[PDB]
Amino acid sequence: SWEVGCGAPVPLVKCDENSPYRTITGDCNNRRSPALGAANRALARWLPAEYEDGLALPFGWTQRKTRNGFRVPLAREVSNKIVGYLDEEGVLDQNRSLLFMQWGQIVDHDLDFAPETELGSNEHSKTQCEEYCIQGDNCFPIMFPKNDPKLKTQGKCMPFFRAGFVCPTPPYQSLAREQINAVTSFLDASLVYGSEPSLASRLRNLSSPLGLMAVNQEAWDHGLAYLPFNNKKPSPCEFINTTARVPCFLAGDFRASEQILLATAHTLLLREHNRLARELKKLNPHWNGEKLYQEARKILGAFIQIITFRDYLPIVLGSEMQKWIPPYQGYNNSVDPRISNVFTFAFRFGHMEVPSTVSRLDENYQPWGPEAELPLHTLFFNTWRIIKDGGIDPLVRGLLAKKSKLMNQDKMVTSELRNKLFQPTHKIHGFDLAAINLQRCRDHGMPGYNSWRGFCGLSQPKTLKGLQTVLKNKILAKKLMDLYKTPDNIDIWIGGNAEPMVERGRVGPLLACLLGRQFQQIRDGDRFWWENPGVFTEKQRDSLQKVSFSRLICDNTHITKVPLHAFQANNYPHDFVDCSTVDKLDLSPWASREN
Ligand code: HEM
Ligand SMILES: *[C@@H]1O[C@H](CO)[C@@H](O[C@@H]2O[C@H](CO)[C@@H](O[C@H]3O[C@H](CO)[C@@H](O)[C@H](O)[C@@H]3O)[C@H](O)[C@H]2NC(C)=O)[C@H](O)[C@H]1NC(C)=O
Ligand SMILES: *[C@@H]1O[C@H](CO)[C@@H](O[C@@H]2O[C@H](CO)[C@@H](O[C@H]3O[C@H](CO)[C@@H](O)[C@H](O)[C@@H]3O)[C@H](O)[C@H]2NC(C)=O)[C@H](O)[C@H]1NC(C)=O
Ligand SMILES: *[C@@H]1O[C@H](CO)[C@@H](O[C@@H]2O[C@H](CO)[C@@H](O)[C@H](O)[C@H]2NC(C)=O)[C@H](O)[C@H]1NC(C)=O
Ligand SMILES: *[C@@H]1O[C@H](CO)[C@@H](O[C@@H]2O[C@H](CO)[C@@H](O)[C@H](O)[C@H]2NC(C)=O)[C@H](O)[C@H]1NC(C)=O
Numbered sequence: 239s240w241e242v243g244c245g246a247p248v249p250l251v252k253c254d255e256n257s258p259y260r261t262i263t264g265d266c267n268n269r270r271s272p273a274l275g276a277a278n279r280a281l282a283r284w285l286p287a288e289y290e291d292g293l294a295l296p297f298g299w300t301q302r303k304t305r306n307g308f309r310v311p312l313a314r315e316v317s318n319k320i321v322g323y324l325d326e327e328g329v330l331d332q333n334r335s336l337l338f339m340q341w342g343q344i345v346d347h348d349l350d351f352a353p354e355t356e357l358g359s360n361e362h363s364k365t366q367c368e369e370y371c372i373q374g375d376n377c378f379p380i381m382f383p384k385n386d387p388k389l390k391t392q393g394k395c396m397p398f399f400r401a402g403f404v405c406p407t408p409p410y411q412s413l414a415r416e417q418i419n420a421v422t423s424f425l426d427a428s429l430v431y432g433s434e435p436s437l438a439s440r441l442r443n444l445s446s447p448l449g450l451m452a453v454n455q456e457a458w459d460h461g462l463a464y465l466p467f468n469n470k471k472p473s474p475c476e477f478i479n480t481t482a483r484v485p486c487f488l489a490g491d492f493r494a495s496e497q498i499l500l501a502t503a504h505t506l507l508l509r510e511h512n513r514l515a516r517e518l519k520k521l522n523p524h525w526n527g528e529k530l531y532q533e534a535r536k537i538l539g540a541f542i543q544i545i546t547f548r549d550y551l552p553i554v555l556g557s558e559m560q561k562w563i564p565p566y567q568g569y570n571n572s573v574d575p576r577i578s579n580v581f582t583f584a585f586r587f588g589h590m591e592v593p594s595t596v597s598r599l600d601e602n603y604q605p606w607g608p609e610a611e612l613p614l615h616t617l618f619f620n621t622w623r624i625i626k627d628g629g630i631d632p633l634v635r636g637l638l639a640k641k642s643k644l645m646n647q648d649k650m651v652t653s654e655l656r657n658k659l660f661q662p663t664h665k666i667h668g669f670d671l672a673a674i675n676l677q678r679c680r681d682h683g684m685p686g687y688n689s690w691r692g693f694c695g696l697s698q699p700k701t702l703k704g705l706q707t708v709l710k711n712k713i714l715a716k717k718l719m720d721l722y723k724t725p726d727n728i729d730i731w732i733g734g735n736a737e738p739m740v741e742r743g744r745v746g747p748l749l750a751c752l753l754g755r756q757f758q759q760i761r762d763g764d765r766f767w768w769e770n771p772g773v774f775t776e777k778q779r780d781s782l783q784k785v786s787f788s789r790l791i792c793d794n795t796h797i798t799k800v801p802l803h804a805f806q807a808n809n810y811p812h813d814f815v816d817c818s819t820v821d822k823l824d825l826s827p828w829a830s831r832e833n
């Protein structure tokens with residue numbers, strides 16, 4: 239009896255073993271072990287958790303306790319001394335479009351979500367944490383350094399609440415603390431449809447037999463849909479501009495409105511589901527609502543899987559791609575498809591790819607208006623700019639014509655995210671995503687940098703000179719040493735991202751290994767992987783591999799000129815072709831004949 243028992247945050251259902259459709263919760267994917275990969279279960283552990291008291295307290299909680307003999311540096315100090323920079327000039331990725339960054343966030347949200355602990359609204363807890371900066375229970379504050387300008391301007395700390403854990407929610411005492419993944423581990427478009435039956439149903443248009451998703455009724459985009467507004471007040475979206483009073487959107491995932499470009503991608507996907515569903519109603523007039531919904535949903539999930547694995551991963555892993563993700567051999571029921579705890583930190587390499595501004599372009603791809611280029615921080619939880627400032631068409635063009643930020647050892651995360659992050663729960667544009675990531679690593683009980691190097695079969699630097707050789711950077715390796723005093727204590731998020739990029743990729747050795755294993759596993763352990771014989775017919779497969787993000791844009795926006803390879807850097811007008819030159823998805827293979 240391994241630690242086999244606990245199972246509390248989870249459901250009630252039966253499995254229909256011959257259903258051709260995925261469940262909403264992920265349950266029933268694996269036949270021998272039904273709960274594998276399902277939502278609201280613990281993140282898998284590739285290595286034992288490392289807590290200060292061996293079970294739940296994070297390192298840095300008890301100032302008198304050390305980690306391998308040394309105090310762990312304050313998250314915000316590492317942020318200031320290492321992660322920050324002032325000059326945005328020369329920081330853009332010359333061969334990756336803004337879409338490269340945006341797709342990563344989409345894939346990250348489809349796979350993992352560890353929500354913070356709630357326990358109390360009409361509670362002085364939210365007060366005692368933000369107002370007095372008192373560590374205790376789920377309040378684990380990010381204290382400011384001496385000499386930090388936020389001390390003079392914001393307070394003594396940044397509130398931070400520990401992530402939820404399986405089993406309960408109130409105090410737990412025996413086995414080690416395991417964080418929750420609130421979404422399904424399979425790449426299945428759960429960010430569009432939801433991971434709970436509760437929300438999946440609410441997102442659907444059930445008053446009509448067409449299998450469509452509910453759309454906004456207050457607002458339209460030149461005859462195209464917007465996601466419906468969300469029903470919870472107070473909403474962070476109307477707070478950022480109490481005059482416009484425009485709420486956040488309602489999507490399969492709760493993070494949809496964190497930033498305008500993410501909300502934009504969610505809208506494109508919502509539209510494709512409806513486009514697909516009314517297009518299927520046309521070929522199969524007899525199919526009912528449920529059939530239309532499931533069938534369009536199945537297609538959309540295949541689309542996300544194809545673009546991710548054919549177009550996105552090859553340019554993230556580069557030459558390491560083949561090393562971790564060999565060609566598909568078919569479904570393997572012995573593979574654990576669960577997303578690991580460390581993956582949720584390794585996938586955060588994307589934060590260093592976010593630029594400081596977002597632009598809106600007009601039909602010739604020229605600046606759209608007088609204030610076309612805006613600072614990223616004014617777009618956090620901003621939905622009013624979409625509904626009241628031109629729709630998504632100007633934003634989508636920016637995604638195609640602008641570049642991502644390139645990871646740079648001297649310029650890691652932009653100040654828009656490092657000093658001005660807005661949290662849905664608080665009211666200042668003054669948080670630090672980098673310090674939060676570091677703090678969260680400790681909160682999740684992550685092993686140090688060298689434990690992961692070993693796990694991936696990579697050398698493990700013990701000295702400064704050793705760290706210089708791995709990082710190939712003398713001064714970085716030595717800021718790192720002055721703060722951490724041993725490479726063993728380096729938090730994985732900063733350690734992984736500090737490594738030089740592999741050839742043709744955008745991450746280093748350690749990250750390539752961690753990312754590559756995870757993706758190989760969610761592909762091989764998915765009974766509904768699009769290439770698995772029997773999921774789709776041979777003819778449906780020939781049709782599916784013609785999808786492209788470019789075509790998705792053409793069919794769901796009023797944009798008529800798009801690049802052929804949307805993820806690489808493309809210059810207008812030279813790299814842009816006419817939408818009619820672009821491959822469509824041929825849905826005829828989905829036509830049925832029941833007589
Ligand atoms: C403007 C762009 C982005 C913003 C503003 C943003 C913001 C955030 C915030 C606030 C968190 C919660 C952190 C915590 O409490 O621990 C988070 C988590 C995360 N982000 Fe980002 N993010 C952005 C882009 C990206 C991109 C491009 C990727 C990948 C390519 C990515 C991957 C992740 C992952 C994996 C998590 C942890 C998710 C979980 O499992 O709970 N993010 N982000
Ligand atoms: C900017 O990035 C581009 C995409 O990453 C890159 O083009 C890619 O170059 C690789 C070189 O390995 C080629 O990869 C493809 O090679 C053949 C196609 O001829 C296929 O059999 C392989 O499976 C593989 O997909 C491609 O030619 C191309 N990749 C794609 C997806 O189009 C550019 O070279 C980069 N531009 C600059 C200036 O560096
Ligand atoms: C909060 O949202 C407000 C409304 O969405 C926004 O004000 C709006 O934006 C500007 C005001 O600065 C005006 O837009 C422009 O409209 C035409 C372009 O078609 C121009 O010819 C006008 O001169 C004008 O500049 C809108 O009139 C204005 N709308 C309202 C109702 O005031 C605020 O700027 C937002 N406030 C913040 C702090 O973000
Ligand atoms: C659910 O679907 C119905 C029908 O497709 C939507 O209503 C139609 O679409 C628009 C807006 O209402 C108009 O063309 C007609 O008024 C409707 N036609 C029919 C035949 O009803 C409705 O908007 C959808 N509801 C939600 C919440 O998305
Ligand atoms: C299905 O996946 C399993 C688990 O990943 C694979 O297991 C391999 O088999 C060896 C022994 O034969 C195990 O020690 C390892 O777990 C795996 N090999 C290596 C090199 O790590 C298994 O090979 C897969 N089965 C099929 C039929 O492909």
Ligand SMILES: O=C(NO)c1ccccc1O
Nearest residue numbers: 343346347493496497662
């Ligand atoms: O944008 C986010 N993640 O990419 C995000 C936003 C708010 C809360 C948690 C999150 O992970």
Ligand SMILES: [Ca+2]
Nearest residue numbers: 348422424428
């Ligand atoms: Ca999923």
